[PDB]
């Protein structure tokens, strides 16, 4: 389904360290971040998304409209400028972040009662699975 609305709690996180390292997230931050639990809150109305990711210490918050390119500064993450675009490929939501890093972005989709998130950067892929809270 294309409906990704809800509050989603992480149950699995594969190669998170590899992905953070590919983004050059500093080693000391990685140590704190790597095994934190995550809650992902998605508000979706038509093309309009509001996405909030939360953990004990960190948050990543972003609003976008499907099909509308937006320039991003990746602030507390890796401090880079990218050109972001989120679109649908079937029922997979696909984000491409054009910039220095190759293959940078994510894909998000629903299967059953679960949300799947694939984060990509360089040659690294991180796969996360969430259950609806
Ligand atoms: C569509 C879902 C998206 C775009 C989720 C993005 C989530 C992040 C970029 C996660 C960031 C982090 C945390 C939530 C805490 C652990 C360390 C970070 C900064 C990598």
Q: Which CATH superfamily is domain 1-133 in?
A: Calycin beta-barrel core domain (2.40.128.20)
Domain residue extents for the chain: 1-133
Cα(112) to centroid(ligand 1), Å: 23
Cα(90) to centroid(ligand 1), Å: 24
Gap between the Cα atoms of 2 and 92, Å rounded? 7
Experimental method: X-ray
Specify the long-range contacts of residues 67-72, CB closer than 8 Å, at least 24 apart. Answer: 72/97
Q: What angle do CA 56, 71, 117 make, to 5 degrees?
A: 45
Tokens 């918050």 -> residue: 61
Gap between the Cα atoms of 106 and 82, Å rounded? 13
Question: What would the DSSP string read from start to end of 60-128?
Answer: EEEEEETT--EEEE-TTTT--EEEEEEEEETTEEEEEEESSSTT-EEEEEEETTEEEEEEEETTEEEEE
Resolution, given in Å to one decimal, reads 1.3
For residue 63, give both structure tokens: 């609003």
Gap between the Cα atoms of 13 and 48, Å rounded? 27
Burial of residue 133 (number of CB atoms within 10 Å: 0-12, 13-18, 19+): exposed
Q: Is the CB of 29 under 6 A from ligand 1?
A: no
| Centroid of chain to Cα 20 | 12
Contact 50, 43 (CB under 8 A): yes
């Amino acid at each position: 389904t294309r409906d990704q609305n809800g509050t989603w709690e992480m149950e699995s996180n594969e190669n998170f360290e590899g992905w953070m390292k590919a983004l050059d997230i500093d080693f000391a931050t990685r140590k704190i971040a790597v095994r934190l639990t995550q809650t992902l809150v998605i508000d979706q109305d038509g093309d309009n998304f509001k996405v909030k990711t939360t953990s004990t210490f960190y948050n990543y918050d972003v609003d976008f409209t499907v099909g509308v390119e937006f320039d991003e500064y990746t602030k507390s993450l890796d401090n880079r400028h990218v050109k972001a675009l989120v679109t649908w490929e079937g029922d997979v939501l696909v984000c491409v972040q054009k910039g220095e890093k190759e293959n940078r972005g994510w894909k998000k989709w629903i299967e059953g009662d679960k949300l799947y998130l694939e984060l990509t950067c360089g040659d690294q892929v991180c796969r996360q699975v969430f259950k609806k809270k």
